[PDB]
Write an enzyme that holds these catalytic residues in place. Structure first.
Site, mmCIF file in Angstrom:
data_model
loop_
_atom_site.group_PDB
_atom_site.id
_atom_site.type_symbol
_atom_site.label_atom_id
_atom_site.label_comp_id
_atom_site.label_asym_id
_atom_site.label_seq_id
_atom_site.Cartn_x
_atom_site.Cartn_y
_atom_site.Cartn_z
ATOM 1 N N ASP A 1 -2.690 13.370 -100.853
ATOM 2 C CA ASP A 1 -2.793 14.989 -100.384
ATOM 3 C C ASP A 1 -1.947 15.533 -99.245
ATOM 4 O OD1 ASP A 1 -4.850 17.215 -102.092
ATOM 5 O OD2 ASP A 1 -3.885 18.128 -99.299
ATOM 6 N N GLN B 1 -6.442 27.734 -93.780
ATOM 7 C CA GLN B 1 -7.620 28.939 -94.453
ATOM 8 C C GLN B 1 -7.788 27.594 -95.412
ATOM 9 O OE1 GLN B 1 -8.956 30.888 -92.670
ATOM 10 N NE2 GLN B 1 -10.482 32.582 -93.455
ATOM 11 N N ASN C 1 -11.753 26.249 -92.120
ATOM 12 C CA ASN C 1 -11.021 26.990 -91.664
ATOM 13 C C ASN C 1 -10.371 26.122 -89.857
ATOM 14 O OD1 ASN C 1 -12.000 30.137 -93.490
ATOM 15 N ND2 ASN C 1 -11.210 28.689 -93.988
ATOM 16 N N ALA D 1 -11.094 25.335 -98.134
ATOM 17 C CA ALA D 1 -12.162 25.594 -99.521
ATOM 18 C C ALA D 1 -12.925 24.843 -98.079
ATOM 19 C CB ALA D 1 -11.716 24.505 -100.008
ATOM 20 N N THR D 2 -13.352 23.493 -97.442
ATOM 21 C CA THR D 2 -14.253 23.895 -97.025
ATOM 22 C C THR D 2 -13.780 23.986 -95.674
ATOM 23 O OG1 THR D 2 -14.275 21.401 -98.508
ATOM 24 C CG2 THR D 2 -15.994 21.635 -96.210
HETATM 25 O O1 LIG Z 1 -6.364 21.283 -90.889
HETATM 26 C C1 LIG Z 1 -6.015 22.233 -91.775
HETATM 27 N N1 LIG Z 1 -4.611 22.528 -92.086
HETATM 28 C C2 LIG Z 1 -3.696 21.868 -91.808
HETATM 29 C C3 LIG Z 1 -2.601 23.719 -91.417
HETATM 30 C C4 LIG Z 1 -3.813 24.218 -90.377
HETATM 31 N N2 LIG Z 1 -4.128 22.892 -89.149
HETATM 32 C C5 LIG Z 1 -3.524 23.287 -88.332
HETATM 33 N N3 LIG Z 1 -2.707 24.128 -87.299
HETATM 34 C C6 LIG Z 1 -1.823 23.529 -86.126
HETATM 35 N N4 LIG Z 1 -1.365 24.773 -85.535
HETATM 36 C C7 LIG Z 1 -1.152 25.978 -86.085
HETATM 37 C C8 LIG Z 1 -0.486 26.137 -87.755
HETATM 38 C C9 LIG Z 1 0.214 26.383 -88.480
HETATM 39 C C10 LIG Z 1 1.019 27.440 -87.852
HETATM 40 C C11 LIG Z 1 0.621 28.166 -86.677
HETATM 41 N N5 LIG Z 1 1.424 29.023 -86.892
HETATM 42 C C12 LIG Z 1 2.288 29.791 -87.318
HETATM 43 O O2 LIG Z 1 3.192 29.225 -88.054
HETATM 44 N N6 LIG Z 1 0.939 31.214 -88.007
HETATM 45 C C13 LIG Z 1 -0.705 31.352 -87.681
HETATM 46 C C14 LIG Z 1 -0.390 32.509 -87.440
HETATM 47 C C15 LIG Z 1 0.577 33.479 -88.681
HETATM 48 C C16 LIG Z 1 1.532 32.263 -88.490
HETATM 49 C C17 LIG Z 1 0.107 26.958 -85.655
HETATM 50 N N7 LIG Z 1 -2.703 23.142 -84.710
HETATM 51 C C18 LIG Z 1 -3.599 22.138 -85.809
HETATM 52 C C19 LIG Z 1 -4.314 22.092 -87.196
HETATM 53 I I1 LIG Z 1 -5.447 21.008 -87.651
HETATM 54 C C20 LIG Z 1 -7.149 22.132 -92.917
HETATM 55 C C21 LIG Z 1 -7.384 23.606 -92.585
HETATM 56 C C22 LIG Z 1 -8.266 23.908 -93.774
HETATM 57 C C23 LIG Z 1 -9.039 22.716 -94.360
HETATM 58 S S1 LIG Z 1 -7.868 21.428 -94.080
#
Ligand SMILES: O=C(NCCCNc1nc(Nc2cccc(NC(=O)N3CCCC3)c2)ncc1I)c1cccs1
Ligand SMILES: O=C(NCCCNc1nc(Nc2cccc(NC(=O)N3CCCC3)c2)ncc1I)c1cccs1
Lengths: 628, 628
Positions: free
Chosen positions: A137, A19, A24, A21-22
């Site tokens: 970042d 989640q 999700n 800012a810009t």
């Molecule tokens: O891009 C971003 N930020 C990088 C992070 C989000 N992006 C991606 N995340 C996955 N996969 C993924 C990730 C994390 C956690 C999990 N699973 C878990 O541990 N969970 C989730 C529910 C609770 C337990 C699966 N693939 C691709 C991506 I792209 C941005 C998000 C908002 C602005 S930038």
């Protein structure tokens, strides 16, 4: 229930990954194929909406492809809200942050997994650099993890390039807190976080309104210190230019990693590295192979990092740097036999080695037995408060401690099982030295027997001659007598080498602990119960409140979390530790007795060489008398 | 939603563990403590309700306590329905049936886990026998599994004693289908089911209205056959008194297990065992320890089951039974060195051995290389039908096949990595034989040099004498000449033992596969994807119907289940198998060349002994001439 969609993709709003800012990130699927994709839906996009600039921009990032970068597939428009949606590749394993959430990695990632992190982060960051784009970042939260076809983890980068039209507070650069240095800063904070399992600079209270100290810590930047933490409220800062004791990394790696982080973590661009300096040193570390070496003298395992093209001379030097053993005093043993290594032999042609099957090191000089050096960490206090946030943090903390205890216990068992083998190899190898001394003795014996016989016979057959004969007879008796002394004293050494000869390894097959005890398995069972409760408390924190039943179950399990931990810690110190220390105590004993015997065997062997040159001046004396 | 309760316990009706005729088992908790318990709620209890007999009865089964029996805690009454509720201990891991549901155990349990099953089942069944109570209904479904404090599984019995006031159809006894034999029958069917992963007697169609054949199979009972299956509709029955090739058990264990099941599986009480006969033979098997032996000649690993009090004579006999090697031809190697075992040495004092670190066997007699003998099993056809039941069975089947392939692939890699070590040990061990032959040569050399010199000198100092001298000189030349031949021919052997001397193990470090390839990890990744889909299809079968979205996701994953399997099987045969067969082919080559060299070294060594006795008749001839 309610869920967004697209022309080609659809997802539920309940499925959330990140989640921002810009935008999700949701877990979505392709409407046709049904394959899983990462769905990036942009929140609040109106005052910008540059469909001219972002068009070509997203088209550029589209064709951008790398193994260490999260792939962007397509740019589509939401059906109803008409929001722009990016299609990233789905990473089921989550991010590096998720990996750090694990109690097993509470005190740092495994060494191999850390090498994967370092290699992948550098590779991805370098690929971004070659395109000119700057990140600043970089955080474990935005460093994704996938499982390769070979089973090994692969790390990728995702969230960047959003600084155009617009770092994490703990990963912020000193001057940027209120140059390309701002990059390497967050990278360094990340690398320490992966190695230690904690942040480099920590105030006592933490990242809050009392984080005023933190900025003073960051602006402090003393010398090449890589970390600074105050252990009390508004107290002094404990500085260190080295890694913590609880660090799971090998000593050889810490020696290489320390200067890297030290040079990339400071406000001054004066001493700070560039991307080329950083890449050069880091890639250098990655190119090196691993040398597993178990020193019996100190009872310590070592991992020496050497390039494949280096010689055995630099090898001996590095081994000296860790084990404090002179290059000429370093003796290698492999698979039951000693192994002689030429000073110029390349590392490519070295035998196959593991940490459970390393190259043993024995020395002529007496050395103290150190054993495993670890950080003794006790359990934290469990408060009766129902605070879901508190119960979650406490769960990770207490489980992390037990994880560390089980990790150390596994290492202790490794040291003992390796010790028993190294000793068994040594007693048979020195026995071989006894076997060759017997052979050299027999050579002198055959020389003795016939040479004396000729001189004892010459008098029987065929003042002047009598005087010569007598002198020779005496001389032959001077050596044959000492030959008898050595002959019997060697039988005493053989008596020592014999089972129950006070040099036997019977003590080592008794005192310590064995895989038969299954102590590590015993600890893991309780560790699994705690880990299950931990992830449950994470699940309860997300709900912010629980039903009456869930509320009391949470309380019951929280109390059992304590009981499990105490049960494991008790079994750790009262069984694993104590029996290890006893094995280490008797280890010193056998070492003294072995080195003493080795000194005796050495002298008694060299004396055979001392009398070998004496019989060469006598057997060629009378037998070679001159006459026409 | 709706959930039953008690004075001290409560549970949800959604939490179900087992659904029986008289009672049902739910996952429940204690109202006070919150601990998990198994809740046995009796369905349909009115026409019986013997609160007089069942009172004392349940009180008897209450105090009944054993490690291999599911513990009964209390007997309570449901709040509303007033039904009697039994409080059993909760087994999170489920039953043996649940274990058999795993694709990893589709072709039988691991050998160690099977020993646990056998030991626990016997222990529990014996404890029931001592109380006089008879089960007859023993099935993997009613054999629970828990995790002990040491991590190892512990199996317990639960459902029995319900035959008072009132076996599974596949576990039914022939005469009972339409004596204590009825017990051992189901036990045998269970044991085969745990070893094979399938039922002993299988008709083509299965347990249905066409199960008429099954009764004919069971009433067939030919000799000591332990299994019988028809491979076609209404076809002949394939009989076998042995275990299948796909069985994961060691050969040594199969030799012991075969007669056990054979004697307990028949309608005739004539040849059938009693509980004492059964207990005696089974406990005998359990008491035996494990001997890991890798035969380099056939490239086959072996597990020989021997009692700790037995000698090395019975050991040599059993090794002969499996490897077909004469006791006098069996030569042992351990940790790089040969190990001589006295004919009367007990098994208690044997060195520590594992399957990854066994005792190697080399023989003087030429033996063919067999290698790993396994059952080649291909993938089954995937039908486009949406049948949830069909998709579930197909999932377990196809994943089980891939599991087997990955299991074999792991074994193949083990054989290669063990082969490389065994060869490396052998070349250095035979090198030691060369080292001792050099020593014996030097002994004859020193003997030669001085003995000849005296006789060459006696002529220089001090018809008759000339004739003697000449004859001696010739004789000394007869031996010294052959000494020169052997001397140089040994250098040829040393040339062979030298790196690149055509006996080098360089080929073995090239041809086969290595852990560096990570082939097993590659297969496991695809195996995990399939296993995940499998358990998902199980979850879909329970719902009996799916929503539109879940319906198509089910179809998508089902197609990916095929793609994953084919990808793994291709990588299995085209990489693992082929490179293994190539390693095995060149294995025969090096074996021939090694045995040939060993024959040469033997002869050349014995010749030194042949000339050793010749110089003893000459050095004591002229030098020891008699005179007053
Ligand atoms: O891009 C971003 N930020 C990088 C992070 C989000 N992006 C991606 N995340 C996955 N996969 C993924 C990730 C994390 C956690 C999990 N699973 C878990 O541990 N969970 C989730 C529910 C609770 C337990 C699966 N693939 C691709 C991506 I792209 C941005 C998000 C908002 C602005 S930038
Ligand atoms: O007693 C009986 N029969 C023996 C079997 C039932 N009895 C017990 N079962 C457990 N534990 C358990 C078991 C099985 C499966 C699982 N979990 C799973 O795999 N599940 C369940 C939901 C779907 C996937 C946990 N403990 C104790 C018991 I007692 C009878 C049932 C009805 C008459 S007799």
């Amino acid at each position: 229930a309610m869920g967004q969609s697209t022309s080609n993709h659809l997802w539920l709003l309940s499925d959330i990954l990140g989640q921002g800012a810009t935008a999700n990130v949701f877990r979505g699927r392709h409407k046709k194929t049904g394959d899983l994709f990462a769905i990036k839906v942009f929140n609040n996009i109106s005052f910008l909406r540059p469909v001219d600039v972002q068009m070509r921009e997203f088209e550029v990032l589209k064709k951008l492809n790398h193994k260490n970068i999260v792939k962007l597939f397509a740019i589509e428009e939401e059906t109803t809200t008409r929001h722009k949606v990016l299609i990233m590749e789905f990473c089921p394993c989550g991010s590096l942050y998720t990996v750090l959430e694990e109690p097993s990695n509470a005190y740092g990632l495994p060494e191999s997994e850390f090498l994967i992190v370092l290699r992948d982060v550098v590779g991805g960051m370098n690929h971004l650099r070659e395109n000119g784009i700057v990140h600043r970042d970089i955080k474990p939260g935005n460093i994704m993890r996938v499982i390769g076809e070979d089973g090994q983890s692969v790390y990728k980068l995702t969230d960047f390039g959003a600084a155009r039209e617009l770092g994490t507070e703990e990963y912020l650069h000193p001057d940027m807190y209120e140059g390309a240095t701002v990059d390497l800063w967050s990278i360094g904070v990340t690398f320490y976080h992966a190695a230690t399992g904690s942040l480099p600079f920590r105030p006592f209270e933490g990242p809050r309104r009392n984080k005023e100290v933190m900025y003073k810590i960051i602006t402090g930047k003393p010398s090449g210190a890589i970390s600074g933490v105050q252990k009390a409220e508004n107290g002094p800062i404990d500085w260190s230019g080295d890694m913590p004791v609880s660090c799971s990394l090998s000593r050889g790696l810490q020696v290489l990693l320390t200067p890297v982080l030290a040079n990339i973590l400071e406000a001054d661009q004066e001493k700070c590295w560039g991307f080329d300096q950083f890449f050069a040193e880091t890639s250098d570390i990655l190119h090196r192979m691993v040398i597993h070496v178990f020193s019996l003298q100190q009872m310590t395992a070592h991992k020496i990092y050497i390039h494949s093209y280096n010689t055995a001379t630099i090898f001996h030097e590095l081994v000296y740097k860790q084990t404090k053993i002179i290059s000429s005093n370093q003796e290698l043993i492999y698979e039951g036999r000693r192994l002689v290594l030429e000073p110029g032999r390349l590392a490519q042609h070295f035998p196959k080695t593991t940490e459970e099957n390393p190259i043993f090191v024995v020395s002529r000089e007496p050395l103290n037995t150190i054993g495993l050096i670890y950080e003794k960490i006790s359990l934290p206090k469990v408060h009766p408060r129902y605070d879901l946030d508190g119960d979650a943090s406490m769960a990770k903390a207490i489980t992390g401690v037990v994880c560390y205890a089980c990790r150390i216990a596994s290492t202790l068992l490794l040291y003992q099982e390796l010790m028993r083998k190294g000793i068994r190899w040594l007693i048979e190898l020195i026995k071989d030295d006894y076997n060759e001394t017997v052979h050299k003795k027999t050579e002198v014996v055959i020389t003795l027997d016939f040479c004396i016989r000729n001189i004892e016979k010459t008098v029987k057959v065929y003042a002047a001659e009598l005087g010569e004969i007598s002198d020779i007879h005496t001389k032959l008796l001077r050596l044959s007598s000492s030959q008898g002394t050595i002959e019997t004293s060697l039988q005493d050494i053989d008596s020592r080498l014999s089972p129950g000869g006070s040099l036997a390894d019977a003590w080592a097959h008794q005192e310590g602990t064995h895989p038969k005890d299954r102590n590590v398995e015993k600890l893991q069972v309780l560790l699994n119960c705690m880990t299950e409760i931990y992830y449950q408390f994470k699940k309860d924190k997300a709900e912010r409140r629980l039903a009456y039943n869930e509320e009391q179950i949470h309380k019951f399990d929280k109390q059992k979390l304590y009981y499990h931990a105490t049960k494991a810690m008790t079994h750790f110190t009262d069984e694993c530790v104590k029996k290890y220390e006893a094995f280490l105590n008797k280890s010193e004993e056998w070492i003294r007795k072995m080195l003493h015997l080795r000194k005796q065997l050495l002298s008694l062997t060299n004396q055979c060489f001392d009398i070998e040159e004496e019989v060469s001046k006598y057997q060629e004396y009378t037998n070679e008398l001159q006459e026409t």
